[PDB]
Amino acid sequence: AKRLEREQKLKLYQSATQAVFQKRQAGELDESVLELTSQILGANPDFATLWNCRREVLQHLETEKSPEESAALVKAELGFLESCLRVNPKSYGTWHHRCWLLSRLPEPNWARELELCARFLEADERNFHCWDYRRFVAAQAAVAPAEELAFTDSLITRNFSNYSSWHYRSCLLPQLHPQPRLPENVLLKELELVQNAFFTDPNDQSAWFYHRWLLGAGELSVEKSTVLQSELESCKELQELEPENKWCLLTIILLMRALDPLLYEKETLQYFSTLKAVDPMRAAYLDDLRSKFLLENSVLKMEYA
Amino acid sequence: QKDVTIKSDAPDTLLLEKHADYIASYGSDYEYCMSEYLRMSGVYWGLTVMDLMGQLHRMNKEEILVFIKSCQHECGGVSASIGHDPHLLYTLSAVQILTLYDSIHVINVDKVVAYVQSLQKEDGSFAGDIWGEIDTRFSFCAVATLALLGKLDAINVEKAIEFVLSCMNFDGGFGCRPGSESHAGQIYCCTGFLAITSQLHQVNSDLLGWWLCERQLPSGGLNGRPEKLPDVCYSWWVLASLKIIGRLHWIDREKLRSFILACQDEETGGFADRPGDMVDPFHTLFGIAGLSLLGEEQIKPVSPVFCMPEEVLQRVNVQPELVS
Numbered sequence: 001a002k003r004l005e006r007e008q009k010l011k012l013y014q015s016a017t018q019a020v021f022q023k024r025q026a027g028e029l030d031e032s033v034l035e036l037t038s039q040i041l042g043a044n045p046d047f048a049t050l051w052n053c054r055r056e057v058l059q060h061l062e063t064e065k066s067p068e069e070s071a072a073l074v075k076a077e078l079g080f081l082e083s084c085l086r087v088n089p090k091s092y093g094t095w096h097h098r099c100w101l102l103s104r105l106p107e108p109n110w111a112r113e114l115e116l117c118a119r120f121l122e123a124d125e126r127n128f129h130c131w132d133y134r135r136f137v138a139a140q141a142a143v144a145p146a147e148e149l150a151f152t153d154s155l156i157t158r159n160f161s162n163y164s165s166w167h168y169r170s171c172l173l174p175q176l177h178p179q180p181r182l183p184e185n186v187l188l189k190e191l192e193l194v195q196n197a198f199f200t201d202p203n204d205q206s207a208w209f210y211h212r213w214l215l216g217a218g219e220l221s222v223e224k225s226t227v228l229q230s231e232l233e234s235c236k237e238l239q240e241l242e243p244e245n246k247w248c249l250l251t252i253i254l255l256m257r258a259l260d261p262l263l264y265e266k267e268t269l270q271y272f273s274t275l276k277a278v279d280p281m282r283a284a285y286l287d288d289l290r291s292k293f294l295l296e297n298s299v300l301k302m303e304y305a
Numbered sequence: 306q307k308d309v310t311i312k313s314d315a316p317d318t319l320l321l322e323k324h325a326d327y328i329a330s331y332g333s334d335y336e337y338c339m340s341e342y343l344r345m346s347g348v349y350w351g352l353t354v355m356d357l358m359g360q361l362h363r364m365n366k367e368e369i370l371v372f373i374k375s376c377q378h379e380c381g382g383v384s385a386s387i388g389h390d391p392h393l394l395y396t397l398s399a400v401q402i403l404t405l406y407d408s409i410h411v412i413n414v415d416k417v418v419a420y421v422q423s424l425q426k427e428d429g430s431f432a433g434d435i436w437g438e439i440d441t442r443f444s445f446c447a448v449a450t451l452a453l454l455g456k457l458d459a460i461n462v463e464k465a466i467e468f469v470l471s472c473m474n475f476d477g478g479f480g481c482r483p484g485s486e487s488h489a490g491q492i493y494c495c496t497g498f499l500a501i502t503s504q505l506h507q508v509n510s511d512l513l514g515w516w517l518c519e520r521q522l523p524s525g526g527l528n529g530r531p532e533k534l535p536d537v538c539y540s541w542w543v544l545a546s547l548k549i550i551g552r553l554h555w556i557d558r559e560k561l562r563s564f565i566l567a568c569q570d571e572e573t574g575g576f577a578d579r580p581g582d583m584v585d586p587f588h589t590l591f592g593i594a595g596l597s598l599l600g601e602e603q604i605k606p607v608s609p610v611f612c613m614p615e616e617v618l619q620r621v622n623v624q625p626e627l628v629s
């Protein structure tokens with residue numbers, strides 16, 4: 001029944017593959033190969049040579065068909081690809097064939113492609129193939145970073161699988177303020193946004209990773225000094241509420257570094273001890289980080305006039 | 306949060322004899338026939354894991370050499386299997402195999418070089434084949450293939466470097482293309498690339514190293530990016546990258562070792578992505594290779610760059626300097 005039938009699957013796939021290759025050697029670049037490969041590529045989208053066969057067929061058919069006949073084939077290809085993506089949304093072959101197809105169309109509908117991306121990202125907000133495809137589409141349609149920035153906000157606040165959305169922001173933000181290291185006002189707004197995230201969900205590692213980047217991405221003004229001090233106290237508050245939360249402990253150390261390495265030396269060293277106890281797998285990392293910070297402190301101490 | 310829990314009776318000993326029997330017998334079948342499209346890499350995974358275990362002789366050298374020769378196309382590129390299309394992925398795998406066998410001149414090396422050269426773009430990137438898919442995976446395949454042939458000078462290295470570095474991200478990692486999110490497999494390809502091209506000083510080793518060691522979950526296993534399940538093959542992608550950048554000690558070796566051993570199938574031999582799952586040769590290689598990086602006594606030292614026995618690379622004088 002179950003195991004018995006996949007013998008029949010094999011021999012059909014096998015026979016269909018046989019036919020495709022025989023046809024290909026014969027120079028038979030026609031719709032029969034499209035039909036044969038549709039049957040195989042659905043279950044086996046990583047069979048790259050068959051995607052190549054489809055492209056060779058479509059290229060050949062384009063030569064001996066009317067514009068409207070070629071347009072029909074394209075629309076059928078789009079539908080085929082969408083059905084394939086529903087079954088396996090992470091196959092490199094499928095996404096690339098779609099890219100190849102859209103890149104050669106005279107009048108592509110990019111807004112429709114962006115919507116396909118929105119839909120696939122609703123199902124899996126971490127699908128990097130889809131995010132990469134979206135960027136491709138956004139580039140071709142010349143969609144502005146500001147418009148994509150709005151997209152990332154909705155995704156971040158509506159629910160929590162957010163690493164991919166934060167990553168995208170990290171690439172968009174620099175584009176809005178492109179130097180040949182963010183402006184402080186922009187940084188300050190990002191800090192507020194990410195702080196909201198990791199207090200809403202303190203287990204959300206993506207916000208903590210993105211926050212570490214912001215702590216490097218920009219001498220303290222009174223406002224930045226005050227914001228950072230405020231973050232410090234807020235993380236101590238969280239530390240009381242979630243004493244096993246390692247992300248907040250590490251961020252406390254980093255904040256003190258950002259504030260005044262030498263003034264906070266005592267507290268930094270205490271936090272290292274606590275943090276290693278809470279996150280013993282990272283002990284070797286945390287010792288190397290502490291060693292680095294101590295070396296920096298020695299250098300700061302020696303700069304004293 | 307997302308993690309596996311290792312049941313109390315998971316294997317906790319290394320079953321090398323079982324794994325060698327498993328690979329020795331592989332492809333004697335649904336899975337096998339359905340994965341013809343990767344055959345050359347499958348052969349690479351099997352041969353390399355066997356060689357790491359000291360059991361290469363049990364595989365069929367002569368049969369594999371004839372197979373490799375028949376998969377080289379007129380363009381110089383090598384396909385996954387006979388009648389499939391040439392690709393950088395299978396070109397690298399083929400060259401890796403011939404290196405293991407000291408049989409590089411079984412194929413036309415000048416044409417392989419010409420093939421690789423031809424796939425570089427103006428921005429320094431590489432396409433996987435004539436159909437133009439761009440991925441830093443293919444930057445790695447290009448330089449690794451050329452390094453093993455002594456022909457790294459055949460490509461535009463500075464441009465290749467520039468492209469890879471343009472794929473570096475806020476978290477210290479690397480993506481497939483510029484603006485693509487970091488993940489462990491990609492990081493391996495780009496750090497491997499940077500090792501081969503002598504550019505490891507451009508990696509933020511403390512930052513990337515941190516992101517990589519944070520892949521280790523309470524189970525001891527490694528995932529490939531934040532918030533995903535662990536998978537034994539990350540014992541390769543993560544550990545190799547950490548070794549390249551001199552930060553292998555930043556993960557817990559004993560807990561990872563116990564996770565990798567728990568992924569073995571004590572009945573069939575082989576390793577699976579996670580304990581109790583069905584094994585495959587891919588996960589068997591990376592389980593064994595990960596254990597070797599951790600210093601497993603019964604397994605040959607492995608190159609973190611090439612994922613081949615170090616003694617093989619020593620023999621051909623191709624041993625990129627690491628961070629330490």
Ligand SMILES: COc1ccc(S(=O)(=O)N2Cc3cc(C#N)ccc3N(Cc3cncn3C)C[C@H]2Cc2ccccc2)cc1
Binds near residue numbers: 490536578585588
């Ligand atoms: C099991 O269904 C599949 C799915 C995909 C593929 S694949 O596209 O050809 N390829 C090779 C691969 C080979 C085997 C084996 N034997 C098993 C898996 C696997 N994956 C998938 C995988 C591995 N860990 C988790 N996942 C989901 C990697 C993939 C991409 C890759 C190729 C070469 C080098 C590195 C990575 C093959 C089988």
Ligand SMILES: [Ca+2]
Binds near residue numbers: 361362364365
């Ligand atoms: Ca033999």
Ligand SMILES: [Zn+2]
Binds near residue numbers: 536
């Ligand atoms: Zn895996």
